[model samples]
Every structure is written in C-alpha cells, then in structure tokens.
Target chain A: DRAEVRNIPFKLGMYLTVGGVVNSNATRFSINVGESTDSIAMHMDHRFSYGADQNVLVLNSLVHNVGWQQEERSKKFPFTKGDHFQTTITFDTHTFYIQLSNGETVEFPNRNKDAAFNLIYLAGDARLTFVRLE
Target chain B: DRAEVRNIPFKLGMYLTVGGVVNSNATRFSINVGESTDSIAMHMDHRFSYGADQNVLVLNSLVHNVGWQQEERSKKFPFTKGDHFQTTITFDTHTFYIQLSNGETVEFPNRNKDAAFNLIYLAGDARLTFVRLE
Candidate 1:
C-alpha cells in the first residue's frame, strides 16, 4: 500500500470500528490510545490481528497505571473469522461505553479529559467499514 | 464508635455502588484496579466522595497508562444526594461496559484475562448498598 500524509478521517464523538490485521507479515497494529474530552466512545476488535501485544484491543488514560482491554483473544471465537462482528462505543461527558457482540457492555474512560482530539489512526488489515455519527 | 478490619465486602464480577464519603476527616477511597481475567463488568459512581483522585471511578489493567472514569465530579448533579442512583455492569468474556445515568454505555476492559480476584475494597463515606447479579 502506498502512503501519503492525509488528515485522520475521524471527528470527535464519531463512532467507529476496527477489524482486521495490522501487518500480515509483522502482525502489528498501532493507533492513538484513546479519545479526548467529553466525547463518550467505544470500539470492537474481531481477532484480525495476531502477535504478542499485537492482538486486537483498546486503551485509555483514566488511570496512569492501568489500561482498559477492549478485546481479548479474538481468535478464539469461531464466529470472528469471515464473520464481521462490530461493536458500538458512545462518547459521554467523561468516558466511553462499549456494547459487545454478546449484548455485554464495558466502560472506558476518556483521556485528555477537558478537550477533544480529531486524529485517529488504524493499522493492520483492520477494517473501518462503518463510521457514523449518532 | 468502634471499627475493625472486615474482609473487603465484594468479589470479582460482583456489582456494587459506592456513594458517600471516605474519611469525613481524610476524604479518600481506594479499591483494587479492575477485575482480573475474563469477566465482562461495569461500575457506576454517584459522587458522594470528594478529594484528589478520590472523586469516584474505576480502574483496569487494559492499558498501562489508562484508568476508567465512572463518575466525573458528581457534585454537579443535584440528583446525586439522597437520590440513590446505581448503574449495572455485567461480567462477560472480556471488558466492562458501563451504563451512565443518561442511558449511555461506556466500555471498560477486564485485566486479569485468565484469573479472578476474590476481595474488593470500598472506602470513603461511599455506599455499596445494592450489589446483585443478573
């Protein structure tokens, strides 16, 4: 894939999903940790990435010593392969709420607490098939 | 007034609410960071506690530099005092999804991906009045 510096294709409070492999060769996916400010948010990963720490996941900045896990061992789900499963995240006053495939919900805190950031990066073969505002 | 050490009154995946104060004299609330292992979980804080880092929140091992924020400055809600508002968190396979007072859901990752912790702590004048399973 050829590359050029383009502005990140995301806005504050916009909900998005990333599902794919980062590097088919290196098996790595890297992106901005979490969203900033009053925007509540959420994300879902469906095992497309593989490797140590390269697995699908999410990160936040509420606790300097802790990180929130978005997905764990996504490969274990037989429903994950060829089955595009996506989740929803809502941006609120101070945190992001996640709704999982199994009707479960997880909470991720909003880092950059009093402001908003507009750049979101996605690596791996992950797919951002659907991104829209609610 | 008499006080003694009682085993922290909660367990991993156990849903509890804390609302009140810690040391009306000191003002601090500390609890173990996140649930260890596969546990879809969530928590809600309704303020009641006031102090630095002692406001009202949740923590997880998802990201090294991240912490989950359940409530941000509860004092802003006139609905906080004597309101007895509580949210629900579910223990699934991974992550914690939070549902806020405004019908919003935030996701929090579950750390201890392969294990569970048996004890939990609640400080400040906070209240863990209703902790039930679904």
Candidate 2:
C-alpha cells in the first residue's frame, strides 16, 4: 500500500501524518535528528491517540532496517497527539545516550549489534507524518 | 550486554567503543549528529578495518536500533580500515537523504518503515573504536 504521493521532506522536526485503519487511525509523526541514512528518530506509537494511549517511541539505528536490536526502555509511559514529544540522543563511540521529551534519559551501548531491527510502523489506513528534528 | 561501566558523553562527533571481537575483533565507531536520541550516524563495517576488507555503513534510525529499513543500496562496495571514511546525511520528514564519504547520495522514502533491522556489528574482538561526527 506504499502507493500514495509522497511529498514529505526528510528534515528534522515533527513529521506527522494521518494513520491507522478508519476506526482507529491516528496521527503518525517523529522528531528526526540529522537528515538521512545516519539519522536518529523518536517515533510515535501506533493506534494513534491525541491524549493517552501514546505509550511508546521507537528508536532507530539504520538508514533502513540495517542494524541490531536494542529494543525499548520498557518504561511504558503515556503520550498524546498534538502533544509533540522531543528527545535528544548524544552519539559517542561507546553508546547512544538518550534524553526524553520530559528530560528523562537512558543509554544503549554498542552500535554494532542487532540494534537496527527494532523499529515502528507509523503508516496505516491513510495518515499524516508530522516531524521535527533538532 | 547493556551492562554498566560506561561513561560515554553525548555530542556531535566521533564516538567509538570496543566492539565485536572477543574473537573476530572489529573497530566500532560513529559520527553523531546531535546529542541524545536526536542524532545521526555513519557507521563502519565490522571486522576491524586496517586495509581491504570492509563494506557497508549501517545507518542508524533510533537511539538504539529503532526505525525502518531502507536497507542496503546494495552497490557492493568494499572498505579498508585506517581508511577513515566519512559522510553527511540531511534530516527531513519525507526521507533520510544520504551522502557517503566517497560522495554518493541515495534517498529512501518514508522514515516509518521496517528499516532499522539492517545493521552491522563492528565488535568481534577486544577492538578499538574510532569515530567522529560533524
């Protein structure tokens, strides 16, 4: 179903779009860092919600699915649409030091493992892709 | 092995850590875009490069392997360490535009794909991490 007209620009910031099946679609978006293959992202959870039910953010490590798996922090927090979450991940030779939308943080060491296999699917039904990167 | 004993910092530059190895021995390093989860990385081939025997740069999507797979552009290029290569990626919503140290650009549509599974491992032996980001 990747047959829609894409006019999205791969910049940094909240990239949002309408998502999900008709009954449960939501806004899909991300706060992208950098711009391309070597970029980072804090993406939204599926099933889309503007308030509550937004409990996850997918962390990426490949231009595509090209890395290992360092899955979620398993913190199970809540999120909302239009809420606009933003986080920062400082990159170093050792690990990806992460900070959350509310200043919380964590780190995942070793960028050379199965870390690129964990990602999110923000597209569904017909949605918008809201994004922003800093 | 997300073990403790890490004192890595978050910044826009080269970050390297002893990766792979224990046996195979490869150098692990990355050039980050920003600090925290909002970053970009142009990583190197696993297997410790010194001169002839390297291929691919795993593009990161998340703080730790989170995003979609644009997958390998599959040009089948080789690399050598001490080779010290670099590239630049511009961030946007439409895609993660990529540029290589050798000067090549490829664009993948959408950052919300299963593109994070395509990563590499540079840790094989007690290795040396060499990384820098601009």
Candidate 3:
C-alpha cells in the first residue's frame, strides 16, 4: 500500500518538509503532491539504477484530462543506500521550489494550475520518517 | 557509532524538530543536547524494552562538573515499530518544552546552566530522518 498525508493545508508561503531513508536495494521512489489521487500537481521521482541511469531525479506532472506533461530532470542525484534525505518544498502561484538535502535546488512549473494542494503520496523502497508543514 | 551535530546554535525561542523511525528490535534510544559531548543540558531517552519498562520516555540532564540530575518521566509513550515520529522542541531560559508526534508535550529543566547549546547527539536503534532548526 502507498503512504500518504491527506488534508494538508499546502499553500503558498508555507514550508513542507519530507524526510526519509532510502532502502539499500531501491530502484526508484516517488513523492507526489496534488489535490487528490488522480490530479497530481507535482511528481518527484528518484531513480537509482533505473533503465540506463544509475541515479536520476525526474520531475513531472499530470493534468486533469491531459495525462502527463514533459519530464524535467535535476542535474544531480543525492540519494544513496541507507542515507537520510530531506526535501523542503514551497510554492508560489506559478512554480514550486524544492530544497534537497544535499543543498541542491530543483524548480518546476505549477502545471496543474491549482492554487493549493492538500495531499501527499509516497511510494517505493524508502521509509518515510516525517512530514511537517509550517 | 554515535551520530552528533556540533556547532548548532540552539538557543531560547528557537524551534528544533527531530524526526526518525524506531527500529523494531530496539531496546532504547537517546537524544542529547549539550555544549559538548559529555556535558548534557537535556537528555531524552526513550526506552522500549529497556530494563523493566516496555515503552517509557525518560528525561534528565547532567550539569557541568556534576553527575546526573534527577530524571523526569512522561506519562505516555507514542512510538511504535515501523512508525514515523516527529518531535519539536522549543525553550525558554529555564525549560525545554517538547511536543511529540502524538500531541503530547514533555518538559524538563535546563540544568546545564547555559544560555545556549551547540551540540546534538543521537545514539541507539533508530534511523534519523531529519533535524531542522528554525
């Protein structure tokens, strides 16, 4: 089953931090934000040994009836086996800015066109330690 | 091995959040804040199957050039196996107030007699997900 935080008041000017540890044999993991299960405003996927890449960070979105958008990739992958990682995300009306644990940053457009997001979904080989909104 | 964070400016009115997951076979874990490795200002020890206790929250400290101080105990134990936990700690000049993930608060005296602390130590069976100071 997937792990999620529901009914969160994720809006502009609010800080949300997601912290977790990656599994040793992880192939991929995802952190998703949206209004519901189907309308994903942001999809953050970290692939370790996925396809032809050893480590990669992929960012994308799913619109209401438009399926998926173009994928945006981060320049660095900072996850390793049994390593603790944290990502802090905040957004404005047009974009979301994410701060990774290794002090790298990733920005992507708010393509879902929603003013606020209330749901978070986590999946794959990782143990979520905490999710905090302030 | 012990994991520590040094040179942190832990002071009055500052908020610190510690997040982690408990190991299933853990007997106990401790979170310590102090000016140095040996001189603890506050010690938070959660004993799961420790000594005669099943799940207990023990709070204590060690003053400079003094031995251990008296211990304080919380009435509730909110940690469980495979569960994520977050604890927020803020302080005044005399007391450290901690808010647990289960909505419980624990308070202990700052016996080290210092205005601020710069070290944090974590020991025992747990995976630390994140530590944030704001």
Candidate 4:
C-alpha cells in the first residue's frame, strides 16, 4: 500500500525520520521525496532480491517531462524482513544524507532544479509506524 | 492493529493533530494522550452507536493509582463510519482543547499532576493516516 504525506513545509536544514515494519515476504520497498510523483528529487529504492537486484539500495531521481537520471547503488542492506527499521534523512541545497537503521549513512546529490518539496511517499510491502519531521 | 507514536515531545502549548479513517463497521475509536496507558492526561473516545452510547464523544483521564476520572460527553458526532476524520489537540496546564473535523472545539481538564507526556496512542477500528505535532 502507498501512503503519502503532503502539504507540509519541507525545506533545507530539516530532518525527516521514518520508522516502519517491513513485510515478511518483501521483495522491495521505497521512500520518495519530491514535489510530486512525476517530479521526484530523491528516490531511495530498496531492492530485496528483486529481478536483477539483490540486497541493494538504489538512488535516483525523475523530472517531470524529462526522464530518470543515472542510478546509484549501495550494498548497505541492513533491513531484515518482518522487522522494524528506522531511517533519518537530512539535506541542504547541495546533497541529501540518509542514516540507515544499521548506523550506516548514505548520501545522494541534489540535482533537482526546484527546491520546494512538500511530499514524502512510502510504498510497497511495508507498513509505516511513524514519520517525524523536525 | 493499534499504533503508538511514543517518545515524541508532547508538551504544553504544543498542538497535536491526527488524521485517519474510521472503519466502515466502526462502533468506537479513540485517541489517547498520556505518559502511558497507566497514566492518561486525556482520553477522547468516539462512540458511534455503541451500547448505551450513540454518536457521543466521551472524554476522561486516567491516573495510574487513582484510575479513570469523571467522564464527560459531547453532542458532537461529526465522524462518518467509512470516511476520514481529523482532530487537532492543544493544551494548557489546566485544560485540553480539541478541534474536531466539523470545526467544533471541545475542552477537558488536565487533571494529571505530571506535566510531561510524550506518548500518543490510536486504537480501535481506525487506521491512522498521519500524526503531526507543532
């Protein structure tokens, strides 16, 4: 199921944290930060043994009218199926940094032209426990 | 399933807003604010055609040692069984104020002697969409 939190002030120098329980038979899950579905700034996709992907974290973005950007992959797969996980993300005008549940941090560059993103989306085989923005 | 948003800063002069869906066959649901279940500063229970209670909102508090305080009822019943509802709550040291989905405001006394409470509980036939604290 997909859940979206919209119309909140999302600006630079704020921390957005989320907690959730991954599905037991999970293949993939994702968190998307963007202006909307068509204009995503940061797309953090967790691929759990999916087709051509195994225990990898993929990072990318998509612009409206344009296509998807180059994708980056990380081997930091600290999530277990049916278990609780937490991640904290913060960013500035230049980059996005994410701290995973396993105490690992990952970074992705800010390539979006527009900087006013007020939407946070969670989807796939998972149920969100809480979302905190500060 | 019950969802609890714990360990957040819920203090005086803070506004907590919760959005959710009331189940189609829902008879009752509740939003709890407290230190824990053992100690509640406010319990706002919505009774939708339950036994001896019909479309009435019941408010009360529970102390760990002294048990539940005097219950108060409101004629406001703006929630639909199969639709979305939102409520925002803010409190002073003396009273709790809640703004309902229909733009109705209700108050309950802050009887709990303890001033610090950071736990929020949502239970019964409802799925929480979001919880916002400001």
Candidate 5:
C-alpha cells in the first residue's frame, strides 16, 4: 500500500528512519519527502525493473510549478525482496543524506532549502514496519 | 508525494472516488488497488512520458511470487497536466473498471478475487485532494 506522515514540523538536524520489507517480486518502490505533495525536496525510487530502467535506485525532486529536476541514480541496489531493510535520512542546509543498512550512503542536493518540509511519503510494493523521526 | 489508504474492506458494487490535480509538467503517476501491495488486483499507470511509454494509460496487475502480468495500454490520454481530474474505481467478479473524469472508462481483469482487497495506493506527480469510498 502506501504510508504518509504529515505535519510533523520537520527541519534540519533530524534523522528520519524508515524500516520495511520489500515485496518478494517487487519491480519498484519509492520514498519521498516534501514540503507539500508536489513540492518535494527528495524523491528516491528503487527499481528492480521499470520501463527502460532495471535495478537502479533513482533520486530526484519535484518543484512546485517547475517540473521534475535531474535524476541521480545508484546501481548498487542491495534490497532483496521480502527482506527487511533500514534507511536513515538526514539533512544539511543544502543537501540530503541517506544511509542504508547495507553500508551504502547516498547524497542529493537539498533543492528546496527555503521550504519547510512536513511530509514523508512512501509507496509501491513494500510493507513498512515503522517511520520514525529522531 | 503519495497517498495510501489501507484496510478499506473493498468489494463489488462500491465506488471509490479519488480527486486530484495533475502536475503541470507531469510525466507519470500510478494508482493501484490491491489485496496487498504485491497482490494487486488492478494497477494503472498513466504516463506522459516514462521510457518508451508516452501519454499512455497502462493497466496491469502484480501477482505474488509470479511478478507483474501482461499490460494493456490505451493511447487516448485525456489527462492534461495542471488540470483537475476525478477517478472512480469499482469492481466486478472478474473485472476492474475505472471511470475517468475525462470521459474514459478503462477496464482490467480482477485476478485476486479469492483474496479480498484492503489497499488503495497512489503516487507520482499528481496532488491528491481526497480518496473516498462510497
């Protein structure tokens, strides 16, 4: 299904931790952090296979009224379907950092630094165990 | 970024209404109704452009352990970015029907009848205003 946590008054210096199990035959799943639904600051999509993509982790953002930004992809996908995984997200003034349980770290620029974010959203074929901001 | 409603207790003879505004420069989005995420009964992906899919409405399903089934595509994409839209989903014993606000009715087979569905999942460039079951 999907999970959304909104209006949490999120800011920098917070660690957003998400835990879930990927679907056994999942083709794709995504985690998004946003100021609002369309004003996303971060969009991370992990794909096993979607159209022209296969086994790549895509990172991008959606700007309100501006369309999607360029994509950053990671080919080191460690997500095994039906296997539990952990991801911790943190922020800097101008960047976002993702630390995976598999010892991989990903970084993307904080494109919406002026906007205050309060939405953490997830969707696709994964069952989330928890979404914690600490 | 995303909207997900779970434990819906869905069945035939009921209408699920979802209202949203598509992004002005949207590329793609998806709505999935499922017994569970990997056990989807209907998966509709609307693409303005994703890989080879351009302005196409894709209908498919995900079977647990069996992966995604064949897809049905419609090129009559009536969804214009930055426009408001309404979608109503209902089901039959063997078919899933989608009534779009743009006067299009799309249908897909109901593949998971034995397993009652509980999840309505949505994601991508659209800003959802509501997900209502009536």
Candidate 6:
C-alpha cells in the first residue's frame, strides 16, 4: 500500500537486490528501476489475486511522458504467502535482467536504451526487509 | 585461477549475488557456499571449455568428510566472453536456489541441512568484480 524510491547511480555490472516478506494477507507488490519514478526502465509487478492465475509476475517499462510497453509475464510463480522473497536485477548495455526468487528470470529492453540509470522504486503490500545496490 | 573464501553469517532470506566480467579467453570458473572449503553446501562450476558443452554450469554439494554430491548442470548458458555476468543465490530450509544470467535456475539440496551457513568460495579464470550478500 506504499511506494518508495531511491537515487542510486548505475554502472555496467551493478546488482540490485530487494528482500521482503509477503504478509499473510498480501495480495500484490512490485519493484521498479529507472531514472525516476515516472520513467521506469523496468517494472516487475506481482499480482497474487489480480488475474485468473494466482501469483502472476508481470514486467514492463514506463517512460516519463510516454506510457508503458508491452507487458511480459513470468512463466513461473515462485512466491508463497507469509514467506520471504528476494529479487535481483542487473543490466548490460541492451537489456535489464531480473531474476525472481523462484529462480526464473525475465528480460526487458532498456527502454531508455542506456546502461546508466539511478532510481529504484518499490510499491506493494509486502514488507521490505532490505534493499541493496552494489 | 585461485580459490577464495569468506565467512558470512547467514539467515533464511539473505541473497548473494556475484558479478564479474568473463575473460576474453575464459575457460572455467566456480562459486561455492558452505561453512568451510571442505564442507561446501553448494558448488557452481561453469565450464566454458572443460566439457562436451562449450558453456555448461555444473552444481553440487561437498561435505567435510562425505565428499561431493551428484553434479547438476544448468540447461542454459547466457554468459559470453569479454562480457559482464551476474549470478544470484538464495536459500530456504531445504535447498539453495540459484539464478543465472540467462534466466534459468537450478537447485541444490542443503546438504548441511540447515538454513544457516557462513562461507562463500570463488575460484577460476573469470575476474571477480564484486560479491555481495544481503
């Protein structure tokens, strides 16, 4: 039910990891990376009760003035209620690689089309235990 | 090619991500986790030129006096020479979940059979850029 963002300078091989625990009543959550909250280079949305498939992971990109790109859903759901989870993201020159807790990964084009970025955002019902950029 | 180990007290949700740039003439490298060098709970050995496959990722567990478990190799290899790569590892009560740069995951049983561990080992031709546990 809350959204958070941080200004973290980027590099070619930096890894960003988010850790949190899904509440017993949790329903959805998301993690984003970009230059700002409005210009997300990658968006990872997890919906526990929003679609026909429970615990669906949706990913996309959002530009500041523009909108979102096509939504890509993860092929696997590795999250469970009341359990802790971790998500790791890294970028190369062309794309953003997101590795989910369940060992599945999804890729999104660097819509900003650059290897440099500085912002990370998190929003949802899951309680964040830690977030690291290194 | 050298082997190095770090003592990191562990918990259930800690996430470990290793980032590095593969050498132009890279042939092999590995990352491991456990309480000591002789008691590796999980071993990830990447063979770019040591096996039938050009880039195969083999995983296993080694106990202090019990020796090594059966080797488990990943089905995908997304790493390229002269390029940067990232590998993320997390654990639960039963197993270690590993995510590769190519979006594929493989699991190794927690031979130590506990959620707590303290050592990480890395050895090989790939230059270690950064390693973080959080």
- In terms of DockQ, the best-performing candidate is 4
The alpha-carbon deviation from the true structure for residue A33 of candidate 1, after best TM-score superposition, in angstroms, is: 6.8
Pairs clashing within candidate 3? none
In model 4, pairs of residues that clash are none
Could you give the interface RMSD of candidate 3 in angstroms?
A: 13.3
Q: Write the per-residue lDDT of candidate 1 for residues A15-34, one digit (tens) a residue.
A: 54432222334433333323
* Highest lDDT against the true fold, candidate: 4
Report the TM-score for the A-chain of model 1.
Answer: 0.47
Candidate 6 at residue B72, lDDT?
A: 81
After best superposition, candidate 6 residue B54: deviation in angstroms? 2.7
Residue A75 lDDT in candidate 4: 93
What is the TM-score of chain A, computed separately for every candidate?
Answer: 0.47, 0.41, 0.93, 0.95, 0.92, 0.87
lDDT of 1: 0.37
| Interface Cα RMSD of candidate 1 | 24.2
Candidate 1 TM-score to native: 0.30
The Cα error of candidate 4 at residue A10, in Å, is 1.1
Query: DockQ for each of the predicted structures, in order?
Result: 0.01, 0.02, 0.03, 0.06, 0.04, 0.04
lDDT of 5 by residue, B1-31 (tens): 3566555356577677877788988889888
User: What tens-digit string does per-residue lDDT give for candidate 4 at B22-69?
Assistant: 999998999999977778889999999779998999999888888887
* Residue A92 in model 1: lDDT: 56
* Tens-digit per-residue lDDT, B17-83, candidate 3: 8777888888988888887656888899989888787789998887678777898887678998777
Candidate 4 chain A weakest ten by summed lDDT: A1-10
| Candidate 2 regions with alpha-carbon error over 4 angstroms | A1-54, A63-70, A76-78, A113-134, B1-134
- The candidates, ranked best first by TM-score, are 4, 3, 5, 6, 1, 2
TM-scores for every predicted model: 0.30, 0.27, 0.51, 0.55, 0.50, 0.49
| Cα-based lDDT at residue B45, candidate 6 | 84
